[PDB]
Structure 1
Amino acid sequence: NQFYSVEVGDSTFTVLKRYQNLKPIGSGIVCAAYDAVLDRNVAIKKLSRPFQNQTHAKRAYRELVLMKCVNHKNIISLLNVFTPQKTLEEFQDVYLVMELMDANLCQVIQMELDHERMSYLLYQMLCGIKHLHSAGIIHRDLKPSNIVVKSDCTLKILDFGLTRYYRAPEVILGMGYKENVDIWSVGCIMGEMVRHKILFPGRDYIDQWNKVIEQLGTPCPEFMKKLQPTVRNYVENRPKYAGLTFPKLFPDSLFPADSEHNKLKASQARDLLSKMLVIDPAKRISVDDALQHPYINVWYDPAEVEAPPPLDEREHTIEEWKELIYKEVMN
């Protein structure tokens, strides 16, 4: 038999013999191992009875189908998909072996970043988001914990979307959305790279909206009327805020600006934040326009952005789901 069992913290990883010296980075649970066939490190993800519920089964199938479908240098790639269980009656675990990077984007927010590396990181996030939007996939739940970094600094994205600090007002207020809903989430990550404090740290959905209007200000009347009247009632009732200007939100001291190059790049950065951190999606800058911003466009590469783009969203019983995933694991 090809596999071998190894104990890792709580769970028992029973992987192939090609993967050796596993190291835990979990929560699915994630292990970092060495592939002996490919001669390089990989990331193994144990899906523990992934068909356990519709939320689990729907996302896991979504993450399966899309990764073997999509192929980008900013969305992590699948290298091997397998299961130790031979039959469907025995089927219990799905292992997703996929490309390994060096660190998490949270680990990066704890650091001082020069404009050169920061604007390149952000550029990369936009490239993947753009390419996802061209497949008809809008992420929505974009977060740093779901973005991985190499010591390059090259960037890749782990998940495909759908801790809540990075969701857009329209997502929070159930308005319905469009492509540029991921420009909000980036502006939350960019501003966090600056402050090092999380921008809108709300304990609940209602509490999080307060931390938006305190800093940015109560959105325009034109925006208000597009809401669910029942929800619109609540927002129109909340106190009015003048909304602090972006120099006051991101003061001089935050940015590295000792040289003239840095001084210019600091305003170009704040000019970007100001366009991304907008409450009304009708006034919020688009991915296409953001890549053309003087801060970002210095990295532009059509070979990456304008790359070729590559089924439904249905309910299934957990008996129906099982077979569905097993089918796509056996491929």
Structure 2
Amino acid sequence: NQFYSVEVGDSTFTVLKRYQNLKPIGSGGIVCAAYDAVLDRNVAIKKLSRPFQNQTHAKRAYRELVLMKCVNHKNIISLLNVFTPQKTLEEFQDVYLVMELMDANLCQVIQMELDHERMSYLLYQMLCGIKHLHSAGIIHRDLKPSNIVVKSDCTLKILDFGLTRYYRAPEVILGMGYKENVDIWSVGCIMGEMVRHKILFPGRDYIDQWNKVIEQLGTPCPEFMKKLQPTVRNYVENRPKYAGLTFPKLFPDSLFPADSEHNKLKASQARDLLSKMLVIDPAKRISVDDALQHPYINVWYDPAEVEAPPPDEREHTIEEWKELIYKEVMN
């Protein structure tokens, strides 16, 4: 047999024999660290249990499997291998996805005191990854630190393809319609969180989250309000009003290292970029291309990374999703 089974965490992993020394990593999906004896390197193995168990799980698993094949960029997940230990469609239960083993997820990195060298390079790569997605017509809308992983040399990869809701843009929260700079918002939320070491807009639901947005950034302009459908517009127009805080007060000097002129200047640059990404109205929020030209970011700008080439959506029953997924897994 090509497979063996082992108990990692609370789950059973049935994997190709090439993958050895399985060890659990992180929290959440169900993922393992392993040594791959064929490639002679360390990999991560994700177990999707019964991805066809409901139409929501199924649509996501299918969509992501299909896009992981599509895409080609060093800041986006690229699969090394995909397999099921089950031999037939009737027996089909689980899918295993294999990729590079990194060193940490971005939530761990955010907890570090980071210099501007590291923070700017992390943000640079997020923007390269996001630009690549958009170039293939993929607008993420749910970018968040827990789905981003990092190596020790600060190399980063985004692991999912989008649509914890703290990183979602106003247009997502309010059902507005969006363009590509919807994902800037989330990058802006991550950046702010790297500075504050606190989640910027930690709402338990969308009402609470909107409240924390307006409390800090201020009530948006009328121009913004009339882009909202009338009933959501009613809600938003009738919230308690807020003038909002300036970005120096949102992100005080105390948050930034002040030990050199380099760092003083980089602090002012970081706050400038933040003030252009955390903008409620997407008509006035910075784009991905403009952000890549910002002085905080442009020091890293490599056209081979920024301008790399990119290579329907119905509903189905779970029976139908199982077959669709089984097919993709088998090719």
Q: What is the TM-score when the length of structure 1 is the normalising length?
A: 0.98
The whole-number CA distance in structure 1 between the counterparts of 2:172 and 2:223 is: 18
Deviations 1:153-181 (A, max 9, x none): 11111101010110001100000111000
SS state of the match for residue 182, structure 1? helix
Deviations 1:130-161 (A, max 9, x none): 00000000000000001001000111111010
Deviations 1:3-29 (A, max 9, x none): 001112222111111000101125441
Question: Offset of 1:72 from its aligned partner?
Answer: 0.8
The whole-number CA distance in structure 1 between the counterparts of 2:321 and 2:114 is: 44
2:4 maps to which residue? 4
The whole-number CA distance in structure 2 between the counterparts of 1:196 and 1:26 is: 20
The whole-number CA distance in structure 1 between the counterparts of 2:92 and 2:112 is: 44
Deviates more, 1:63-72 or 1:262-271: 63-72
| 1:75-94 equivalent positions in 2, closer than 5 A | 75-94=76-95
2:328 maps to which residue? 328
- How many residue pairs get aligned? The number is 330
The whole-number CA distance in structure 2 between the counterparts of 1:153 and 1:185 is: 20
Deviations 1:89-125 (A, max 9, x none): 1111111111211001000111111111110100000
Deviations 1:282-330 (A, max 9, x none): 00000010000011011100001101112x1110111111111111101
Considering Cα pairs closer than 8 Å and 6+ residues apart, tell me whether 1 or 2 has the greater RCO.
2
The whole-number CA distance in structure 1 between the counterparts of 2:82 and 2:132 is: 24
| 1:302-321 equivalent positions in 2, closer than 5 A | 302-310=303-311, 312-321=312-321
Question: Offset of 1:68 from its aligned partner?
Answer: 1.7
The whole-number CA distance in structure 1 between the counterparts of 2:325 and 2:117 is: 42
What is the Cα-based RMSD across aligned positions, in Å? Answer: 0.8
Deviations 1:59-102 (A, max 9, x none): 11111111122111000110011111111111111111112110
Judge conservation of contact 2:72–2:310 (CA < 8 Å) in 1: no
Deviates more, 1:270-279 or 1:107-116: 107-116
SS state of the match for residue 215, structure 1? helix
Give identity over the alignment, percent.
100
**Where does structure 2 lack aligned partners over 5 or more consecutive residues?**
none
| 1:129-148 equivalent positions in 2, closer than 5 A | 129-148=130-149
Question: Offset of 1:203 from its aligned partner?
Answer: 1.0
Which stretches of structure 1, 4 residues or more, deviate above 6 A after TM superposition? none
Question: Offset of 1:31 from its aligned partner?
Answer: 0.6
- 2:189 aligned with 1:188: yes
Judge conservation of contact 2:30–2:47 (CA < 8 Å) in 1: yes
Question: Offset of 1:257 from its aligned partner?
Answer: 2.5
SS state of the match for residue 274, structure 1? helix
**Where does structure 1 lack aligned partners over 5 or more consecutive residues?**
none
Question: Offset of 1:253 from its aligned partner?
Answer: 1.1
